[PDB]
Design a protein around this ligand. Structure first.
Ligand SMILES: Nc1ncnc2c1ncn2[C@@H]1O[C@H](COP(=O)(O)OP(=O)(O)OP(=O)(O)O)[C@@H](O)[C@H]1O
Ligand SMILES: Nc1ncnc2c1ncn2[C@@H]1O[C@H](COP(=O)(O)OP(=O)(O)O)[C@@H](O)[C@H]1O
Ligand SMILES: [Mg+2]
Ligand SMILES: [Mg+2]
Lengths: 389, 227, 41, 371, 647, 254
């Protein structure tokens, strides 16, 4: 009777759909559970649409009946007045006025414009990485934790001593040392607005578009009460300014200068704390590296023996390794290696076991993995160059 | 950075320190000095069974009263050993006496930063000169930086950190040479990548008496049985 | 700089080399010199 | 049986559900009937519905919508829309008269998505490849095995390698293994090239990289095959406005996409090249790409296998010996072997025979394999 | 063979009609006893509710260590066996059964995973990134929930009169019982603090401290009888003013004990009729909590007489819902037997019928999974009165369907459709039932639906949805849910009547800083805890009417929620009750179900050293075959022996 | 540490010497040259890249030089580097003659010049000699000998070989149709003519576009003679006749 049961189950599903709502996703429609037609009719008959304009000037701002010069974007500019439901103080000379049609007056104050590209940068889903997934950089974790979390968690211990906590960090180190890993850990552990930015995301085709979105990013952060920004791969736009003779890097230098002025200029930067992740901290501009903008430069040097042993432990926690581990032997056997190298060694040990069709990875498998990842791949390593860099 | 004689912003020759990095890639040598003599036990990394273990010469005889355990790059080690032997024999010829371990170590170290643009790069070898001279047994450690210092017990090589932590945990000033060899072999076995089998390690001893002596397979087997 | 025409040939040939479902798209190119042609082509 | 009783415990609650759903549907007062609600939806959504961008979401029942003409109407969003799938930059359906958000769009994909996706299985298969046993094993362990038997990896406790590099001289089977993986895999195959990543305006390269990997995530499980990645490097083009440094920023965007802040979904990266020394080591690092596998020129046995594969369908003449080709002791590649066979067939049809001969093969030698 | 049998029998028992479940359980128990798998036999006996068989198996067990681990399991489930004075280590087994040392073990886990640092309500609120008596009540509630079972805090353990006086009216009771719940689980040394508070000139404060004593003794079992004394001394003569704190504290303190002395002390105060209807309802509730599952004729009879005696308008008035609730708690899970009570209630009164009948029926069929019963409930749901019976009926579908991993999700779908096609009362109730069907079990459809309907226009539906989402997150402090609750606080910043619920959800989510679980079931997803389900049903039936009960003056039911507070624990012990920190791996669930493949293989390996704070649905197995576990399933406290075979 | 060094003599990420191989491919671009051994003597043909009409004929050869009495060489690559290498070859041969009072053996002279080549590829920062040599000689140890040396300092003894443009095709053809213990000078000249034809297909082997030098032994002396235009024209005419006959035979068969 099994097939009869499945046939009945699917027929029942088909009937439930046919009588409740089946398929409406072509025109992005919703399931009919949350369909408040009674409310939406009153919405369309009682809430008139409002065209978004900008209040340019307030003629006769005194208590006398004022007049506001609005500029309905790309439509027209008008002299208008406020709705009797809107208080005069709720509207300034730069807010998005939000005026109705038909004697453009039914006002709703409206926040600053944010580019969709910039606003699609807040970290909504927090990374699944924690501070316990980072090993061999205890002091770096402590310093980064201080700077980014501790003021945002217990500000009393800072205002008691009257200290301004450092607001700005530069995580710098060779390719694969825990820079982006620690950024993800900070994003996961932080209760605040985390905004990730990628140096390549500030390269835009039209002059003044990189600086424009830097300004928008920082002013959105300012609108939010407690914000951590994280410029990863900051090498992209952050580079020492050189005159040249053909105007090279003028646009990227302009957006970098906008970032500089936003970090520390003729303005209180706000409650924004910034991270700069890089593996070439020798191109960054001296102004960018000034401790008024990057206060707490942190070096993610290649882990020492203890750090490598800890990283091996971390990456082999969930593996099916055998009794005797000798991860200390592995750490001494693969010096001047990165956490990326170590995780690859663990993965290759697991794959050697899988290829042999075993369910237990042994010390011989780990030694083969070290030979494959550290010795054979030694010619593709980035450390010999990026340690100089 | 470009050039072999450039200083880092922190104060760093860049080449001495890359040489130190190279040292951290070598086999583990452990030297101990005691009132009864100096012991030198060095891991002998045998990569294949077809390699004649006796041909891996990491413990060498500078003179009848000084031996040297090398780690890092064995060919640079050999160059430094040849220079040390020539210097000891020159000193004997001129003065009709024996080089002190300190004197020979400093004479070798004065050749450590003699590169430029002669040698083009530093010697990527760390040496343990264990000898006996007028002032009793002395063990001197030299590193590519040319800075030599005499240690009560030193461990150079890949397992330097763990070996020296164990040397702290075990070593005491009032110990006998037999127990020094015992502890050195225990530490070397602990940090060994494979099993200690009496053919993958070199052991040597310099006593106030008999000249520098490299333990044979029989004595090595006896000690390894004891451990 | 390198040749945009040669870039386009190389990309189209990469597509046609088994990554094109259709079977009747031929690619012809015209050049003045044989040596300067990209080694990839 | 246990499973039969499970499915019965499902079907009985389902029948309960239809009973309740009917009951309610009839006691509705000749209104709110699913069809009646759909008709009311049509009535309230207007007969034309303009497509406009969603600039931002202010809250449920409100949003700023940019009309095609540039106006920026702040307007309500009705219960009709899912209040989901709505992110700044999305298309939105707006009631003509009141511009109310009454639907969403982008049900279609872009031409970039269409071109990148390989909506086909290349006819080449692992059986059509001869000599690359170890390379096939490793690429399978990286791309196919984690998809077909995730149990191995999950039980072992390791994650599979994220990327693989196929590095080898000009013609050794790199794109051939890419074709075989595309043929056999159940994941969506997205093919790109390095010169194809090198864009013209400033910021187009990074934008294309981001779009490619976003498409890969959207169509996950996916395999992104970047052939001739060294083209982003070695080759220099005047169309590139930014030049070497814009190339560097595109490479940096690739770095971030391969291993950056954002958590990847199921997107395995294959990347092929014949000049691996020109690649940025940061790009090749183990976290981004492990499994750097070489494709050396075939030895004598492998060359024999290539000739057998590529002559399996040709009617070789009895006198033809597929041994002199191999005895030619040069840097012979599989591409060279296939071209020799193909041009031998071309001379066969030129001289009107359906059977290839030793002379045809020799003149093919002299023609394509100019040595 | 063994695996085939046992697994098929367990699954079929969960998935089979009523008549065959008992027989299948009998044969499963027989197979376990034949193959000498005593802990499995005990688990089957408990899930059968066969105290006689439980005693037989436990006494037949002649191994001291296995008997002690059985005692741990039975204490966690909640039962106080009256063992005779001739067994293997009588005193140790009896105290393990009584569940003492739980304070020490909980503190030890806290120290191993340092969480002893107090978290003030403002710390969880995080207002620095985003009133009056209501806010004081909410802050006290969340403080208590977060610092439960620690005996530590920063508001009340420090200067506490300030907090008490900042709280107003029933906020006094709220704060006092919040302190009680902070000192919960064997801080009976805290009788000192609660006594030197109840030595007060304020009636609310004194009664709240009495409730604090009761709740501290809740779950605890001390042969000194540290509750009956206080409770009787206070409740003997003053049965006119409030009495709710005292009665509720007694009930919460003793619960599954089912001690005739406390029964006969609670019955007369209910039957006197000189105590307000609130006291009568709370007394019936306390009787039910004391006797959760007895078929107790005395309790049933007194409830019937109370329902008959109370006037028609009194029954109309709320707080009468707790009398049939007490009767159901008495007839908890007993199944069909209730026919007599059902007929009695049917003949009692016409309008109160639907309510009392449905409540007792659902509370008696809890976990049965009777599809025909749920069909009767759904027909009652379809028939719209043009409501209290409607809400208790939806709660009934939840309560009866929270037994199968498939029926549970399908009942979630049914609840979604119920909200879609529902009426005011139906929609108001659905969130409570949808919380019951999943407690301390975050699920990314439950959370989404509750979050969506929190914003709903209906304020009471919003209340129930927010409390339900907090319930789902209970004891599982989660970044996503905490951010969601903070966002909801921002949303309903001005609305105090809803911001109180939002704050309550925040605190209940961060329960114990994250150590506990309010889920009724335990062990391996099929072991109903009668005390825990009684507490949860109490809280949710009270919430059925949220304005006049919780938002009014009856949050002592929120404090009764404590009846279901049990820890997610994996502490390991030596044969002589000593800590054994041992490497243990964790994961959720994986296997190949071929024939009867056990779902015991875990893939999300995460090596830990016990104590380990495992989450919902994660099975933790040993890291190495060096110790053998006496219990086949590693939940709660365990005793691990040294494998004589080989390390 | 210099910025202008260019690091001529370093290794590459792979053990591949970039300057040496760039010199190799410069040889490949250079004019074609080939040599054939034969029991009676050795010969060396060479394409001419000096085919301009206004270009005078003042030397007896342009690609081919004489090293000593019984030895000649031919250069492919860079003319000036070739001139210096030929001068050094003459110096080496005459130093050996002064020292031992007998002609330098061919392999010894090739080894000496290749030692100089290796010295330039390993020492100093100087670029290597982008010149490939084909030596044809005679000595009392192995008689007629043919050697081919590359910019890397590697030399090999051959029976027939080719360097320069289309050298791969020329060597493939020689491999196909060269007979080991046979092919006296007559057939060797014919083979060289046909190889040069199929190697310079662009031009139909005008007698003025190639130079042939033949080394033989007569009465105990070694004679190195550059074939005159008359003889080259005769050889080209003979090959054209043979090719026409072969084509006619193939067509008649078909
Ligand atoms: N210290 C570490 N501890 C644990 N894992 C590490 C560590 N360093 C690197 N890893 C592993 O490597 C990856 C993290 O590298 P990450 O992305 O942070 O590199 P990065 O330093 O930002 O380098 P890049 O210059 O390439 O951007 C993860 O796989 C992580 O497991
Ligand atoms: N086993 C093989 N090894 C090398 N090439 C092969 C093999 N089998 C077939 N080929 C041919 O080689 C060509 C693919 O070469 P490819 O891998 O693209 O070289 P590259 O990517 O380096 O340009 C195909 O035309 C295919 O027919
Ligand atoms: Mg990074
Ligand atoms: Mg290719």
């Amino acid at each position: 009777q099994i097939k009869q049961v499945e046939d009945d189950i699917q027929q029942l599903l088909k009937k439930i759909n046919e009588l409740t709502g089946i398929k409406e996703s072509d025109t992005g429609l919703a399931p009919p559970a949350l369909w408040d037609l009674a409310a939406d009719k009153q919405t369309l008959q009682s809430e008139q649409p409002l065209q978004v304009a900008r209040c340019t000037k307030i003629i006769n701002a005194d208590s006398e009946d004022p007049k506001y010069i609005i500029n309905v974007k790309q439509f027209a500019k008008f002299v208008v007045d406020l709705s009797d439901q809107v208080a005069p103080t709720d509207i300034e000379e730069g807010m998005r006025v939000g005026v109705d049609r038909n004697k453009y007056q039914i006002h709703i104050p409206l926040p600053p414009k944010i580019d969709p590209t910039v606003t699609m940068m807040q970290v909504e889903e927090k990374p699944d990485v924690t501070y316990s997934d980072v090993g061999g950089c205890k002091e770096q974790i402590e310093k980064l934790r201080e700077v980014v979390e501790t003021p945002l968690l217990h500000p009393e211990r800072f205002v008691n001593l009257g200290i301004e906590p450092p607001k700005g960090v530069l995580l710098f180190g060779p390719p694969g040392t825990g820079k982006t890993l620690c950024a993800r850990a900070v994003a996961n552990r932080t209760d605040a607005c985390f905004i990730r930015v990628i140096g390549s995301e500030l390269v835009q085709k039209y002059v003044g578009e990189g600086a424009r979105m830097v300004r928008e990013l920082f002013e959105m952060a300012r609108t939010k009460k407690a914000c951590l920004i994280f410029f990863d791969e900051i090498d992209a736009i952050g580079g020492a300014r050189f005159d040249d003779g053909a105007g090279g890097d003028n646009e990227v230098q302009r957006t970098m200068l906008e970032l500089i002025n936003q970090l520390d200029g003729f303005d209180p930067r706000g409650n924004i704390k910034v991270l700069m992740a890089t593996n070439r901290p020798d191109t960054l501009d001296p102004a960018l590296m000034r401790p008024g903008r990057l206060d707490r430069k942190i070096e993610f040097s290649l882990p020492d023996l203890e750090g490598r042993t800890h990283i091996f432990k971390i990456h082999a926690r969930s593996m099916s390794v055998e009794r005797d581990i000798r991860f200390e032997l592995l750490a001494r056997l693969c010096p001047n290696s990165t956490g990326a190298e170590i995780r690859s060694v663990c993965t290759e040990a697991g794959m050697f076991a899988i290829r042999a069709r075993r369910k237990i990875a042994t010390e011989k498998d780990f030694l083969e993995a070290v030979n494959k990842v550290i010795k054979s791949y030694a010619k593709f390593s980035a450390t010999p160059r990026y340690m100089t860099y | 950075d470009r050039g072999v004689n450039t200083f880092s912003p922190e104060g760093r020759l860049f080449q001495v320190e890359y040489a130190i990095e190279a040292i951290k890639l070598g086999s583990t040598a452990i030297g101990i000095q005691t009132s009864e003599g100096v012991c030198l036990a060095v891991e002998k990394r045998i990569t294949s069974p077809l390699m004649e273990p006796s041909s891996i010469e990491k413990i060498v005889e500078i003179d009848a009263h000084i031996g040297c355990a090398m780690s890092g790059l064995i060919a640079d080690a050999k160059t430094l050993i040849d220079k040390a032997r020539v210097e000891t024999q020159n000193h004997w010829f001129t003065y009709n006496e024996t080089m002190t371990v300190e004197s020979v170590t400093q004479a070798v170290s004065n050749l450590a930063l003699q590169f430029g643009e002669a040698m083009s790069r530093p010697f990527g070898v760390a040496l343990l000169f264990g000898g006996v001279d007028e002032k009793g047994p002395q063990l001197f450690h030299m590193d590519p930086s040319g800075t030599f210092v005499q240690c009560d017990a030193r461990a150079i090589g890949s397992a330097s950190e763990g070996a020296q932590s164990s040397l702290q945990e075990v070593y005491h000033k009032s110990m006998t040479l037999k127990e020094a060899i015992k502890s050195s072999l225990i530490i070397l076995k602990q940090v060994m990548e494979e099993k200690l089998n009496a053919t993958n390690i070199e052991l040597a001893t310099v006593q106030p008496g008999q000249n520098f002596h490299m333990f044979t397979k029989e004595e090595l087997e006896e000690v390894i049985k004891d451990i | 700089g390198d040749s945009e025409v040669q870039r386009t040939m190389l990309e189209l040939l990469n597509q046609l080399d088994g990554f094109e479902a259709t079977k009747n798209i031929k690619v012809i190119m015209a050049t003045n010199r044989i040596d300067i042609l990209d080694s990839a082509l | 049986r246990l499973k039969l009783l499970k499915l019965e415990r499902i079907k009985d609650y389902l029948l309960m559900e239809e009973e309740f759903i009917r009951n309610q549907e009839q006691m509705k007062p000749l209104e709110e009937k699913q069809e009646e609600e759909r008709s009311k939806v049509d009535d309230l959504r207007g007969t034309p519905m303009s497509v406009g961008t969603l600039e931002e979401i202010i809250d449920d029942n409100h949003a700023i919508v940019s009309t095609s003409v540039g106006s920026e109407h702040y307007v309500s969003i009705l219960s009709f829309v899912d209040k989901d799938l709505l992110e700044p930059g999305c298309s939105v359906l707006l009631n003509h008269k009141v511009h109310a958000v009454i639907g969403v769009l982008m049900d279609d994909t872009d031409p970039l998505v269409t071109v990148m996706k390989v909506e086909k299985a290349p006819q080449e298969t692992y059986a059509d490849i001869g000599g690359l046993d170890n390379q096939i094993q490793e690429i399978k362990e990286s791309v196919e095995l984690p998809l077909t038997h995730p149990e191995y990896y999950e039980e072992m406790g390791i994650k599979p390698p994220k990327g693989v590099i196929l590095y080898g001289p000009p013609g050794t089977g790199k794109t051939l293994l890419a074709k075989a993986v595309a043929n056999q895999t159940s994941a969506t195959f997205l093919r790109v090239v390095g010169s194809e990543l090198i864009q013209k305006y400033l910021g187009d390269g990074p934008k294309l990289v981001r779009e490619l990997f976003r498409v890969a995530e959207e169509h996950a499980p996916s395999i992104v095959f970047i052939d001739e990645i060294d083209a982003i490097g070695t080759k220099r083009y005047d169309s590139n406005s930014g030049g070497e440094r814009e190339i560097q920023r595109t490479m940096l965007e690739l770095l971030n996409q391969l291993d950056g802040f954002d958590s990847r979904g199921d997107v395995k990266v294959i990347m092929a090249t014949n000049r691996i020394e020109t690649l940025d080591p940061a790009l090749i690092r183990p976290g981004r790409i492990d499994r750097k596998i070489e494709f050396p020129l075939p030895d004598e046995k492998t060359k024999k296998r290539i000739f057998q594969i590529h002559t399996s369908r040709m009617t070789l003449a009895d006198d033809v010996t597929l041994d002199d080709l191999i005895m030619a002791k040069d840097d012979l590649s599989g591409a060279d072997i296939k071209a020799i066979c193909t041009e031998a067939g071309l001379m066969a049809l030129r001289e009107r025979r359906m059977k290839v001969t030793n002379e045809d093969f020799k003149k093919s030698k002299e023609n394509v394999l100019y040595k | 063979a063994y695996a085939k049998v046992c697994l098929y029998l367990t699954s079929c028992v969960n998935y089979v009609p009523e008549p065959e479940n008992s027989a299948l359980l009998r044969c499963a128990l027989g197979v376990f006893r034949k193959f000498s798998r005593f802990p499995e036999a005990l688990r089957l006996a408990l899930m059968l509710n066969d105290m006689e068989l439980v005693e037989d198996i436990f006494t037949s067990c002649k191994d001291v260590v296995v008997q002690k681990q059985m005692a741990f399991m039975l204490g966690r489930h909640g039962v106080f066996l009256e063992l005779s004075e001739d067994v293997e280590e009588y005193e140790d087994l009896t105290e393990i059964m009584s569940n003492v040392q739980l304070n020490s073990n909980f503190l030890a886990l806290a120290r191993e995973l340092d969480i002893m640092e107090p978290k003030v309500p403002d710390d969880i609120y995080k207002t620095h990134l985003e009133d009056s008596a209501r806010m004081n009540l909410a802050s006290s509630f969340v403080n208590g929930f977060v610092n439960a079972a620690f005996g530590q805090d920063k508001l009340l353990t420090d200067d506490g009169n300030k907090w008490l006086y900042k709280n107003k009216d029933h906020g006094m009771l709220s704060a006092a019982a919040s302190l009680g719940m902070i000192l919960l689980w064997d801080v009976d040394g805290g009788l000192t603090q609660i006594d030197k508070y109840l030595y007060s000139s304020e009636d609310y404060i004194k009664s709240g401290a009495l409730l604090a004593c009761g709740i501290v003794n809740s779950g605890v079992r001390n042969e000194c009888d540290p509750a009956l004394a206080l409770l009787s001394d206070y409740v003997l003569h003053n049965s006119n003013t409030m009495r709710l704190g005292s009665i509720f504290g007694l009930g919460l303190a003793y619960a599954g004990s089912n001690r005739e002395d406390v029964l006969t002390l609670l019955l007369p105060v209910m039957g006197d009729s000189k105590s307000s209807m609130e006291v009568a309802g709370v007394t019936a509730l306390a009787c039910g909590m004391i006797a959760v599952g007895s078929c107790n004729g005395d309790v049933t009879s007194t409830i019937l007489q109370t329902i008959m005696e109370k006037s028609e308008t009194e029954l109309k008035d709320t707080y009468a819902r707790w009398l049939p609730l007490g009767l159901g708690l008495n007839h908890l899970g007993k199944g069909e037997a209730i026919e007599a009570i059902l007929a009695a209630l049917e003949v009692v009164s016409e309008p109160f019928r639907s309510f009392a009948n449905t409540l007792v029926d659902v509370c008696a069929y809890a976990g049965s999974g009777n599809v025909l019963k749920v069909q009767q409930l759904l027909h009652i749901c379809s028939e719209h009165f043009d409501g209290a019976h409607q809400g208790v009926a939806v709660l009934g579908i939840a309560l009866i369907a929270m037994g199968e991993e498939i029926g549970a999700e399908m009942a979630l779908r049914t609840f979604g459709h119920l909200l879609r096609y529902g009426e005011p009362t139906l929609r108001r109730a659905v969130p409570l039932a949808l919380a019951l069907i999943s407690v301390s079990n975050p699920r990314l459809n439950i959370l989404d639906t509750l979050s969506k309907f929190s914003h709903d226009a209906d304020p009471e539906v919003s209340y129930n949805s927010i409390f339900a989402m907090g319930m789902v997150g209970s004891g599982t402090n989660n970044a996503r849910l905490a951010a969601m609750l903070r966002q909801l606080a921002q949303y309903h910043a001005k609305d105090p009547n809803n911001l109180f619920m939002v704050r309550l959800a925040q605190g209940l989510t961060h329960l114990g800083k994250g150590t506990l679980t309010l889920c009724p079931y335990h062990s391996d997803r099929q072991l109903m805890s009668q005390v825990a389900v009684a507490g949860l049903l109490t809280v949710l039936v009270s919430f059925l009417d949220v304005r006049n009960i919780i938002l009014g003056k009856s949050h002592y039911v929120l404090y009764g929620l404590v009846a279901a507070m049990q820890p997610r624990m994996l502490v390991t012990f030596d044969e002589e009750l000593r800590p054994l920190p041992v490497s243990v791996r964790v994961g959720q669930a994986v296997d190949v179900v071929g024939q009867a493949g056990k779902p015991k293989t875990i893939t999300g390996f995460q090596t830990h050293t016990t104590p380990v704070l495992l989450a919902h649905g994660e099975r933790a197995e040993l890291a190495t075959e060096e110790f053998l576990p006496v219990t086949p399933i590693l939940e709660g406290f365990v005793i691990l022996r040294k494998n004589p075979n080989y390390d | 540490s210099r910025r202008y060094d260019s690091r001529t003599t370093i290794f590459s990420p792979e053990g591949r010497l970039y300057q040496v191989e760039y010199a190799m491919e410069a040889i490949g671009h250079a004019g074609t040259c080939l040599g054939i051994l034969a029991n009676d003597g050795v010969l060396l043909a060479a394409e001419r890249r000096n085919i301009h009409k206004l270009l005078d004929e003042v030397f007896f050869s342009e690609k081919i030089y004489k090293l000593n009495e019984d030895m000649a060489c031919s250069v492919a690559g860079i003319t000036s580097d070739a001139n210096v290498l030929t001068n050094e070859l003459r110096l080496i041969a005459q130093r050996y003659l002064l020292q031992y009072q007998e002609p330098i053996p061919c392999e010894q002279l090739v080894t000496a010049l290749c030692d100089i080549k290796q010295a330039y590829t390993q020492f100093g920062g100087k670029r290597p000699f982008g010149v490939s040599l084909l030596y044809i000689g005679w000595d009392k140890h192995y008689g007629f000998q043919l050697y081919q040396s590359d910019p890397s300092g590697n030399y090999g003894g051959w029976k027939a070989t080719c360097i320069g443009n289309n050298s791969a095709a020329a060597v493939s053809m020689l491999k196909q149709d060269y007979k080991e213990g046979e092919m006296t000078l007559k057939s060797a000249l014919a083979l060289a003519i046909k190889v040069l034809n199929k190697t310079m297909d662009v031009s139909k082997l005008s007698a003025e576009k190639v130079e042939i030098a033949t080394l033989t032994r007569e009465n105990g002396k070694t004679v190195i003679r550059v074939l005159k235009q008359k003889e080259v024209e005769q050889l080209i005419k003979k090959h054209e006749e043979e090719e026409a006959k072969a084509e006619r035979e193939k067509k008649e068969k078909e």
